[PDB]
Design an enzyme around this catalytic site. Structure first.
Site, PDB file in Angstrom:
ATOM      1  N   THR A   7       0.827  -1.190   0.000  1.00  0.00           N
ATOM      2  CA  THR A   7       0.000   0.000   0.000  1.00  0.00           C
ATOM      3  C   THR A   7       0.878   1.263   0.000  1.00  0.00           C
ATOM      4  O   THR A   7       1.855   1.325   0.746  1.00  0.00           O
ATOM      5  CB  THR A   7      -0.968  -0.035   1.206  1.00  0.00           C
TER       6      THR A   7
ATOM      7  N   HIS B 289       1.616 -11.731  14.172  1.00  0.00           N
ATOM      8  CA  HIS B 289       2.498 -12.473  15.062  1.00  0.00           C
ATOM      9  C   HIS B 289       2.124 -13.959  15.140  1.00  0.00           C
ATOM     10  O   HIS B 289       2.938 -14.742  15.616  1.00  0.00           O
ATOM     11  CB  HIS B 289       2.557 -11.849  16.452  1.00  0.00           C
TER      12      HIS B 289
END
Lengths: 253, 255, 253
Positions: free
Chosen positions: C167, C223
């Site tokens: 992005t 994570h």
């Protein structure tokens, strides 16, 4: 000893090894901040703003501002004025989303929340209809609301209705942070520390390194209401207003 | 090489993974569960401060040969960060604390049990240095060498993994300037140590501003807003920054 | 008036004081980003990359590249080429986690999602099998997908299968952001603004201050799939590829 004493409160040493129930102010700030993140899509976009012109304007007009308006001229009314104008110019940011009905409400009032650090904890009084205020009126509203926050003289309407928040994350030295917005609000702007930093400056098409007063302005926005490009356009307007620093007429000296 | 692709930090062993579906190991499965849950039961935010590590770098360069000769371990930046953070957790008991959202009670721990994030081939492990407040810089340096070795060789004890009151993670080990590390309740903070980079900064000597090259580090602190608010996080980091920038650690090295 | 007009759309002033239902694109973005954060463990690691060599290569070879390939040469195909190569080298990042079965799927295709800002809202078309593409093919895919995103000519396969996203958070001036990744993806790389900054340079063992075109590359990673060290190693490969800037052969001149 070589231990640091800077920003250390010796009175807090008694806390060590104890269990204590927190007060209502802090208890609220705890359940509500955990909830805020679960019912919104928060992300923090970072921009840097050259505050050198605002610093020079402040230095020059502060003595006359104090004499005329009775209050000190800090950086906060400049940030507030730039943000309030940009919330009028960017109605999609001064807005709330209803996830049940999928409707966006674009608020006609800019009710600006101000984070106030007090010994009892964080308080966030609101400047209602901040769009109708001048920089001197903003400066007097901050002095009033900060005093009443610290001395518990805040009415129930002083804490409700906020459509956007400004928080001084640089008050204790931070460059930036990812402040938590509280729905129905869609954004919270943090003002990092204003620091002297070497930057590239262009004068007559030639690049040079110069010392400037730089600030990071982290914006936490709700992706339900504001996209990354929307956040950048809103911050670009604020940055342009602050870097142009055409506020001499706004000071009403 | 025969191609322009980068080989830097590329593990050829990971090429075997491409195109496969495998069950993750016990460490990875728990780390996945705990980090997802941690964010849902806390109010995490990351405050960033920068610290001038030039004086600590000069002290380290000057005393590294004698430190290795006397104590037997290499002198890295980590025992300086650990010593500054452990002292700051004693001075800021409100940060070395845990919140109970059911009873609304704050527990201020008397021990500073410092968790150290250790990157291992099997995944992330977080051994704890119990009662780190009673340790010298040489003892800290040895504890890090010991706990990192036993993390990598699956020889940690039950106490090496429980009781942590704060965590320090070296996010600059693989080049990062900063990150927003995830804290794990009951802990209220996790400090990341970014890469120490030579950067041009403004230095004010005798009231005059100048541009100078200094070794700078970003210290991102993830804190739980249930326990620590923005100003407390800044005050806690200000103490750490002051201790590191003053760099009065020559006696602390015990040479 | 002293108000800023920069990035202000006068057409949005009509929204102020109204409640309107959001369009299909915006309703889905709001649903997906709020949900994404609740079913993943997101954190954003920041690295800086010196884009000066890529800028010099672009300036030098842009006329020949446009003449031969028929498409402009922006920075995006260099970022895409470096990220796609790093996703092949780091299969652990081009992966998806299943929290029910505890199984990690390492995708053999690099289907790169590109965030496209459009007046109707954010769209994220996908470049399927981007690992098999050259820089000229990448440059053409971007022009095609961005055009069809803005003119509502995207097909259902054009929006599915993404394994990683890139992005341009610096499109509206931002230095960095903490972009929201959308599971099953495990990472989203943001490209901050490429800014001239004073940095330290080492030539023949001597340090000096120089102006370089620097960019911040914030990586939001899950994570559950990627650790801090994993994220740093993946970004180190990307940074090394961009700073070495050995792309002359890649331009297929």
């Amino acid at each position: 000893s070589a231990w640091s004493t800077k920003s250390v409160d010796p009175e807090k040493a008694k806390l060590r090894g104890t269990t204590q129930k927190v007060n209502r102010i802090r208890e609220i700030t705890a359940m509500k901040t955990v909830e805020a993140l679960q019912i919104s899509a928060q992300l923090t976009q970072l921009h840097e703003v050259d505050m050198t012109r605002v610093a020079e304007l402040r230095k020059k007009n502060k003595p006359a501002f104090i004499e005329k308006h009775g209050v000190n001229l800090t950086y906060l009314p400049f940030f507030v004025k730039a943000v309030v104008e940009a919330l009028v110019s960017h109605p999609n940011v001064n807005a709330s989303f209803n996830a049940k009905t999928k409707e966006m409400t674009y608020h006609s009032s800019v009710n600006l929340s101000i984070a106030v650090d007090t010994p009892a904890g964080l308080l966030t009084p609101v400047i209602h209809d901040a769009q109708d205020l001048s920089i001197p009126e903003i400066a007097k509203a901050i002095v009033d609301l900060a005093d009443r926050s610290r001395n518990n003289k805040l009415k129930p309407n002083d804490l409700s209705g906020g459509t956007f928040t400004i928080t001084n994350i640089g008050s204790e030295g931070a460059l930036s942070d990812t402040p938590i917005l509280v729905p129905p609000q869609a954004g919270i702007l943090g003002t990092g520390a204003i620091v002297k930093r070497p930057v590239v400056i262009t004068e007559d098409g030639i690049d040079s390194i110069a010392i400037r007063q730089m600030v990071f302005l982290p914006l936490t926005y709700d992706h339900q209401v504001v996209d990354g490009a929307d956040a950048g356009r809103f911050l670009t307007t604020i940055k342009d207003r602050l870097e142009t620093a055409n506020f001499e007429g706004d000071l009403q000296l």
